[PDB]
Structures are given as C-alpha cells and as structure tokens.
Amino acid sequence: PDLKIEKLDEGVYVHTSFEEVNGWGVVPKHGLVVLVNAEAYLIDTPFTAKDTEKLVTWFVERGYKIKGSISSHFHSDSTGGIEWLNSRSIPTYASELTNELLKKDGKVQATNSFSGVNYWLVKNKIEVFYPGPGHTPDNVVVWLPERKILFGGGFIKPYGLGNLGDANIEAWPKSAKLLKSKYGKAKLVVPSHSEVGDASLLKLTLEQAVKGLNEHPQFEK
Ligand SMILES: [Zn+2]
C-alpha cells in the first residue's frame, strides 16, 4: 500500500506508511512532515528506504529542502529511514538513549544526538520532550508550539499498550502523568497507529499504563 501524505494543519502533514504483519494484516504508521520557513523536517521516518526516499524527494523536488529528521524511539517504524537519510548526508537526530538502543540492536544510528528533558530541534518551532521510559526506555515526543500539536508516537497507546517487548511498565504511569501535566494544552495528539486525537489521548494513555502495571490493534470484541 502506497505511502500517503495528508494535510494536518498549516505546514504540518501526516505521512502514513504501512507494514504487513504476517499473522494479522497491514498496520498504518504515522509520522509528520513539518514545514518551517519553507524547509522540511521529518518527525519519524517511514519503515523503508524506498518510502523515505519517496517522502523526501516529494518535498525536495517541489522546493522544500529537507533540513533533518528526528526519530521518536528506536523501533524501526520510527527509524527505518535513517540509513537512507545518512547515505544522503541529511542530518538525522535521536536521543542518546535511542542511539544506544540502535547500536545494541545492530542498527545504523542517528548522526546527531541529544539528552535532557527538553531539546529544541528548531528554536521556538520544534521541541523534543522526554517524559521518561514507557513504551520503550527511550521514547520521546515532539511538540509544535505554534499549532499546539504533539507527536506522541509509540508512547501514546490510547486503546491498548501493544507490544510490551521493550516497555517499562513500572515507570510508564509516572512518565504518562508527567507528559499529561506537561502537554494538557495540546490541541492535537498524534499516536503512531491509533487515530489523531485531542489532549484526551494523554489521559487514556495514562489509564492504559496504569491498568498495564496492574498485571497491531486487536479488533475482537
Ligand atoms: Zn515502538
């Protein structure tokens, strides 16, 4: 299924790429393209080199140069395009924790890394926030202050925590509480697979996290 690009707000697009899960079916993965000063920043990179190339070239050829990409966590649904981006010397970014996990997993790393609670990828325009470990030990979210849009990625799991292989279920509630207190002001929250929502996704996630500690989508009901 082809890469999709849909307008979310002025200068904010959702890119949707797709992975086949053999024992289930096809799953959508959302990232963003954010336009700042007629220049493009990737928020998460499509699974494959081919879709990353397609996305990038799509913007570049029409006059919006790719300035960089930020990957929100180490899973390939967020980092699959880092190889291609690096091969073209397009700046790639990910936290130190994310790069360390990529290194351990024998994956190509972002060329640029950062640490701390807040990192401004683009001053006043694109902020990276680390709420603490959750869906993965390294997960971060990306805040766009001008549109009040939060890309939550894999941390935002409003309707089920999903793959717990790499999750920190002990810390996830505290992290989710922090995120919720931090970005209750968001107008839109963008999860990796679930539908774009409002700030209510922050609370649902918390609930999930909590319930989880008490111990693809699942459509059976
Ligand atoms: Zn993940």
TrEMBL record:
Residues annotated to bind Zn(2+) 3: D77, G154, H193
Primary location: periplasm
Pfam families associated with the record: Lactamase_B
Keywords recorded for this protein, A-Z: Antibiotic resistance, Hydrolase, Metal-binding, Periplasm, Plasmid, Signal, Zinc
Residue numbers binding Zn(2+) 2: H73, H75, D77, H135
Residue span, Metallo-beta-lactamase domain: 30-193
Cofactor: Zn(2+)
One GO MF term: zinc ion binding
Subunit structure: Monomer.
Name the record gives this protein: Beta-lactamase
